[PDB]
């Protein structure tokens, strides 16, 4: 009606920037409507860098409590594009394993079990759409010890199942198959889940590294070495991460059903 | 900073609605301040937008046979907007209601190539038809349009789109797959080469085309395809194999299709 256009300019003119939240293709800011309380997150993406599938993940998972609702989104071919989303938490799983722990953050085995069940279930829900998250890692799993609610975030590297893969994302989370340029598949996400599970359970990275120069093929020798036992977690928890990170996919929990039926995740 | 919001709002404020484009989602012709180039602004109803429509636009940005998207505004509690190129005042349907074989061969090669490029993303258009193929008669240029029913390969299917373009496999509720698009291409190819619908129903009787159930298409595919009189034997062989009921007798893949003598 031509009021829509100016309403878009009117609505998205209410938002005011409070701070920069992140540390690049994108930058994330704390936002707020003038005179209104609720805090949002406004993500500004550079021109000619947007992964259109990031929009789909928000929409497809709108009704899943472990994904982040998208309130507004403006894409411009010849400029910046905006995503205005909920602010869900100040913390993430990396905060609970990092070396600088001034706030006495810890995740015991029970907390890891619950997080992993939620993560696996949430990623499975996404996978029903034949989309993979493709950058699952501690920094993209928001969590705080008051809500204790897990939010999967940053769908900017999401991909359609079956398409040719390339070396996007974080190398040290690459599955053997992604290193070998196999098509995007759910097993990519499940391997990253395995690394996350090892990290929150042990507070250490599974494989033998200290790193800007680490390359995908450098990971393969490391995957061939024994996975260290996590000393102070259960035998079931150890058996879980071993089978999550088996080099041979034919010995690995590489599917939803395999993962969710393992003793560790059962009660 | 906040300057980015101002600029983002500013860019979209340059567009002005000129007129609506139907007597029938609503599509409008739009103009931009400082451009003679026209655009198409498509306002989609809240709650019913297929997110993948946006992806097809973006993924096919550099393909000349898809429509370029310039802006997209989404509001979870409002109306969403797509601002895209205005490419043509008509489509292959309007244009068929006298294409010679050579002209049809070019259109088919272009369409098959364009759709193959889309299929590299494991996306299927899923509503290929004459009315969704815009055609600039001046430049003989083809544009695939209306990605509102696009789907990802391997997801379960339902009876969306246009029944009379449904493949045997879509009628049988197989998962979405490239062959859905290729069957529709076969119908398009038959239509432009012959000016007629291949199967034994009155395509000018609207009520009947709209009412026919998917299951009732399958007996029609059993019948032999009428020969197209004044086109090549190669052309006739092409449409015959594009629309073979038995998929083992059908050109159901890009490599199969593009290697047929008619397209060589
Ligand atoms: N919905 C959100 N709510 C709260 N913090 C967020 C949110 N999204 C991103 N952040 C923070 O901003 C950082 C960079 O954004 P991103 O990588 O896109 O998640 C994240 O690692 C979080 O620290
Ligand atoms: N770029 C365009 N140029 C001219 N007519 C269009 C254009 N886009 C859409 N239309 C008309 O609007 C319908 C649907 O809009 P669309 O979203 O572009 O598929 C088409 O089937 C045409 O009738």
Numbering used by the authors:
A (entry chain A): 3 to 25, 30 to 216, 223 to 279
B (entry chain B): 3 to 26, 32 to 104, 112 to 278
Give the original sentences from the paper that presented this experimental model.
Phosphorylation of p6.9 is mediated by protein kinase-1 (PK-1), a protein kinase expressed within the nucleocapsid of lepidopteran-infecting baculoviruses. Here, we present the crystal structure of Cydia pomenella granulovirus PK-1: a serine/threonine protein kinase that, despite being encoded by the baculoviral genome, shares the fold of a eukaryotic protein kinase. Therefore, both the encapsulation and release of the baculoviral genome is regulated by the phosphorylation status of p6.9, thus supporting a pivotal role for post-translational modifications in the baculovirus life cycle. Phylogenetically, PK-1 appears to have originated from its host’s genome, with the greatest similarities to the AGC kinase domain of ribosomal protein S6 kinase A5 (RPS6KA5) homologues in arthropods.
PK-1 exhibited a bi-lobal architecture, comprising a smaller N-terminal lobe (tan) and a large C-terminal lobe (green) that are connected by a short hinge region (purple), which resembles the classical eukaryotic protein kinase fold. The N-lobe contains five β-strands (β1–β5) that form an antiparallel β-sheet, the regulatory αC-helix (dark blue) and an unusual additional α-helix at the very N-terminus that sits atop the N-lobe. The crystal structure contained two PK-1 protomers in the asymmetric unit, which closely associate to form a parallel, side-to-side dimeric assembly. As a consequence of these interactions, the αC helices from each protomer are positioned side-by-side in an antiparallel arrangement and the active sites of each protomer face in opposite directions. Accordingly, co-crystallized AMP was bound in the active site in a conformation analogous to that commonly observed for ATP in eukaryotic protein kinases. Although unusual in protein kinase structures, the entire activation loop was resolved in our PK-1 structure. The activation loop adopted an extended conformation, which appears to have been stabilized by interactions with its dimeric partner, including residues C-terminal to the αE-helix located at the dimeric interface. Our data lead us to propose an unusual mechanism, whereby the dimerization of PK-1 via an atypical dimer interface facilitates constitutive phosphorylation of its substrates. This dimerization mode stabilizes elements typically flexible in kinases, the Gly-rich and activation loops, and by locking the kinase into a rigid, active conformation marked by an intact R-spine and β3-strand K49:αC helix E60 salt bridge, predisposes PK-1 to binding ATP in a productive orientation for catalysis.
